Amino acid sequence: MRRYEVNIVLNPNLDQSQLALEKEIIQRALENYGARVEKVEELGLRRLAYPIAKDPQGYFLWYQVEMPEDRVNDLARELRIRDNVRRVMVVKSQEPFLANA
Amino acid sequence: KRQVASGRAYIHASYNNTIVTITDPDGNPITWSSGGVIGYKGSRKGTPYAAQLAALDAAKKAMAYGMQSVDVIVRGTGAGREQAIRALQASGLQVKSIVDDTPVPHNGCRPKKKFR
Amino acid sequence: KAKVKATLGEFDLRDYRNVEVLKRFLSETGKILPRRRTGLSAKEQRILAKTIKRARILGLLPFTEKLVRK
Amino acid sequence: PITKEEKQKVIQEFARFPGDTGSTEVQVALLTLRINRLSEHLKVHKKDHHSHRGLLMMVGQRRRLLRYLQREDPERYRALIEKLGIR
RNA sequence: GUGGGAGAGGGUGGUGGAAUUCCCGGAGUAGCGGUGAAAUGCGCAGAUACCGGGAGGAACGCCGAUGGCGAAGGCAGCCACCUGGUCCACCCGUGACGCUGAGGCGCGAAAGCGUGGGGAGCAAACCGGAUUAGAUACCCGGGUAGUCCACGCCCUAAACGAUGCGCGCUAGGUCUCUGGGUCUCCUGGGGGCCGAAGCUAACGCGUUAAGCGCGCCGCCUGGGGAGUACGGCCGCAAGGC
Ligand SMILES: [Mg+2]
Ligand SMILES: [Mg+2]
Ligand SMILES: [Mg+2]
Ligand SMILES: [Mg+2]
Ligand SMILES: [Mg+2]
Ligand SMILES: [Mg+2]
Ligand SMILES: [Mg+2]
Ligand SMILES: [Mg+2]
Ligand SMILES: [Mg+2]
Ligand SMILES: [Mg+2]
Ligand SMILES: [Mg+2]
Ligand SMILES: [Mg+2]
Ligand SMILES: [Mg+2]
Ligand SMILES: [Mg+2]
Ligand SMILES: [Mg+2]
Ligand SMILES: [Mg+2]
Ligand SMILES: [Mg+2]
Ligand SMILES: [Mg+2]
Ligand SMILES: [Mg+2]
Ligand SMILES: [Mg+2]
Ligand SMILES: [Mg+2]
Ligand SMILES: [Mg+2]
Ligand SMILES: [Mg+2]
Ligand SMILES: [Mg+2]
Ligand SMILES: [Mg+2]
Ligand SMILES: [Mg+2]
Ligand SMILES: [Mg+2]
Ligand SMILES: [Mg+2]
Ligand SMILES: [Mg+2]
Ligand SMILES: [Mg+2]
Ligand SMILES: [Mg+2]
Ligand SMILES: [Mg+2]
Ligand SMILES: [Mg+2]
Ligand SMILES: [Mg+2]
Ligand SMILES: [Mg+2]
Ligand SMILES: [Mg+2]
Ligand SMILES: [Mg+2]
Ligand SMILES: [Mg+2]
Ligand SMILES: [Mg+2]
Ligand SMILES: [Mg+2]
Numbered sequence A: 001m002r003r004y005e006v007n008i009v010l011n012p013n014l015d016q017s018q019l020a021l022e023k024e025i026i027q028r029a030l031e032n033y034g035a036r037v038e039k040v041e042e043l044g045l046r047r048l049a050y051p052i053a054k055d056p057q058g059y060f061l062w063y064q065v066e067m068p069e070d071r072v073n074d075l076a077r078e079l080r081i082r083d084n085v086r087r088v089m090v091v092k093s094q095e096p097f098l099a100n101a
Numbered sequence B: 001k002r003q004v005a006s007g008r009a010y011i012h013a014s015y016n017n018t019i020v021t022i023t024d025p026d027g028n029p030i031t032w033s034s035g036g037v038i039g040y041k042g043s044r045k046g047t048p049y050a051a052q053l054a055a056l057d058a059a060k061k062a063m064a065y066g067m068q069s070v071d072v073i074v075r076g077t078g079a080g081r082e083q084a085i086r087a088l089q090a091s092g093l094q095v096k097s098i099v100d101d102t103p104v105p106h107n108g109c110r111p112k113k114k115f116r
Numbered sequence C: 001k002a003k004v005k006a007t008l009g010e011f012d013l014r015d016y017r018n019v020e021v022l023k024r025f026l027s028e029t030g031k032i033l034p035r036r037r038t039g040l041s042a043k044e045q046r047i048l049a050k051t052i053k054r055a056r057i058l059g060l061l062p063f064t065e066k067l068v069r070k
Numbered sequence D: 001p002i003t004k005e006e007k008q009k010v011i012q013e014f015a016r017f018p019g020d021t022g023s024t025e026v027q028v029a030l031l032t033l034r035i036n037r038l039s040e041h042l043k044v045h046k047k048d049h050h051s052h053r054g055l056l057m058m059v060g061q062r063r064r065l066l067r068y069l070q071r072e073d074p075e076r077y078r079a080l081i082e083k084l085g086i087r
Numbered sequence E: 001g002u003g004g005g006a007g008a009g010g011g012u013g014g015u016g017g018a019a020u021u022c023c024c025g026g027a028g029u030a031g032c033g034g035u036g037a038a039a040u041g042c043g044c045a046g047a048u049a050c051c052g053g054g055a056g057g058a059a060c061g062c063c064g065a066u067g068g069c070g071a072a073g074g075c076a077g078c079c080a081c082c083u084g085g086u087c088c089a090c091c092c093g094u095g096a097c098g099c100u101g102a103g104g105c106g107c108g109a110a111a112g113c114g115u116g117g118g119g120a121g122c123a124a125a126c127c128g129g130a131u132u133a134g135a136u137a138c139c140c141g142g143g144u145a146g147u148c149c150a151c152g153c154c155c156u157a158a159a160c161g162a163u164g165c166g167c168g169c170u171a172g173g174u175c176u177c178u179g180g181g182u183c184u185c186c187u188g189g190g191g192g193c194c195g196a197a198g199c200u201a202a203c204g205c206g207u208u209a210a211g212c213g214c215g216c217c218g219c220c221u222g223g224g225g226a227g228u229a230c231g232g233c234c235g236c237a238a239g240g241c
Helices: A016-033 A071-080 B048-065 B082-089 C019-025 C042-056 D004-014 D024-043 D049-072 D074-084
Strands: A002-010 A036-052 A055-067 A085-092 B006-013 B018-023 B029-034 B069-075 B094-100
Touching (some): A002 A016, A016 A055, B006 B082, B018 B048, B029 B048, B082 B094, D004 D024
Parallel strands (some): B006 B069
Antiparallel strands (some): A002 A055, A002 A085, B006 B018, B018 B029
């Protein structure tokens, strides 16, 4: 497999049953596409710089994964099809460049 | 006739003209002035004088509309783009924030051959 | 008129997710600072660049802002 | 990619004796693997000339090591060839 | 071979903000635009300036460089995937397997052709506007091909470093990109500048030779006629050798 990072950014006006269902469906997508969880950090609510979807802020999840090769893109197409996910980004992991150290 | 008393003041300057727009804090206009609003005709429109004259004029108008507190937004970099702000500061309105908004592309559009 | 990495923690350059540090390299308008005023090196700066643009895509950092005074 | 044990299969397979990573055998199998993979990519991605060029240089390599083997040890070269199906 | 690195090298998929245009909506009048000054043009069917919403196409500011990658043309948003080349360290493996390359074969900016798509801005031709000896040219306002994408042709150029490739020799200094090191410094590989010896008609070049040598290819032989004419090959053509 390979070492990836996923960022998800959603609409902050979600109640609890909603945000639950979203998260669940993301999990079921990672499973379904081959990707596995190394860890999770969800910082959640924060105030952006430019409005994304007319919204002044957003709800961020960060999921660090390991997975197959070809599948990555199609996986993120499945993530993006969501209506409450206003943004998704993926990256291959990088080693923590420490500068000025 | 609205009785507004606080709002946005836009300056706009090309090297060909100047236009001021007084407006309300969610963006709708109140009055406006320009180079030719005052009778100035030709190239004479892109002077700093008429810049002044217009600022003062639109300021005057809105000041009779009831305007007091006015926060400025300058789009365009031009001839007496300054003299317009420099005027409507001394208008009697109170200039609160002067902001420079001159909008610039991230390189999208092939410009008229004059322009490169 | 001090540089940036002159007063600053010794920190991960290649992290987009963290704003608190990344912002300190942008002007009042969103403009990424030039070398002279950033202080860092060419591989550094080249990396600072990519990190910033990545975060700009996450809406955490700005693409451009407005200039006050004037 | 071409991963590491993905290579080791081949190197350990065409070796003349334990430890030989360098002879014409190894060299030509390795090369020829790289070659076939590229042909696979360039099957789609027809539009990519800058990879294609490199693949020319690559088959030219293969061919040159082969003329070497042939002129130097004929049997081992017929061996290698009928091992890889080619020429 | 192994270990590590830099990169706008290429390709496929996706996606992000600024800006131009246009359509919808609001608020708001008498002008806007444009020039040396003008006019055509657009504006009461409500423009310009302003705020919100949508559609679409192209191009990626800052970073950015006197910088990097590529054989050459050439290559800049970001993410992923497929992939070429190349540098260094280790001194491990093969054992001269090398250089050059007539002929072939392929890539080759822009423009141009063919068949489809697409079309925001620009814009040959073109339609108009002032200059004013006179526009039919510079200046202004419209505008079609084209510019973009897929497929197939075309093969040119100041395709330039006007400098063919490869290797070995021959002071240094300085600025920089990128590896390694015992990291005031040293040691490989790129990119600049000044300069030893040396070369050069001069300008200039000078370890990135235009120096000293060897190998191989291309090419030259006063100017015009003329890159024309005839012929041959290629091309749908324009045209090219
Ligand atoms: Mg004017
Ligand atoms: Mg005041
Ligand atoms: Mg690239
Ligand atoms: Mg409207
Ligand atoms: Mg009129
Ligand atoms: Mg009319
Ligand atoms: Mg709009
Ligand atoms: Mg349309
Ligand atoms: Mg620049
Ligand atoms: Mg060039
Ligand atoms: Mg690579
Ligand atoms: Mg040895
Ligand atoms: Mg031996
Ligand atoms: Mg030839
Ligand atoms: Mg061509
Ligand atoms: Mg073309
Ligand atoms: Mg034609
Ligand atoms: Mg066409
Ligand atoms: Mg036009
Ligand atoms: Mg005339
Ligand atoms: Mg025109
Ligand atoms: Mg040149
Ligand atoms: Mg020539
Ligand atoms: Mg040449
Ligand atoms: Mg010679
Ligand atoms: Mg070094
Ligand atoms: Mg070091
Ligand atoms: Mg050097
Ligand atoms: Mg040097
Ligand atoms: Mg010199
Ligand atoms: Mg001398
Ligand atoms: Mg000589
Ligand atoms: Mg001399
Ligand atoms: Mg030499
Ligand atoms: Mg010479
Ligand atoms: Mg003659
Ligand atoms: Mg000719
Ligand atoms: Mg003929
Ligand atoms: Mg014929
Ligand atoms: Mg011709």
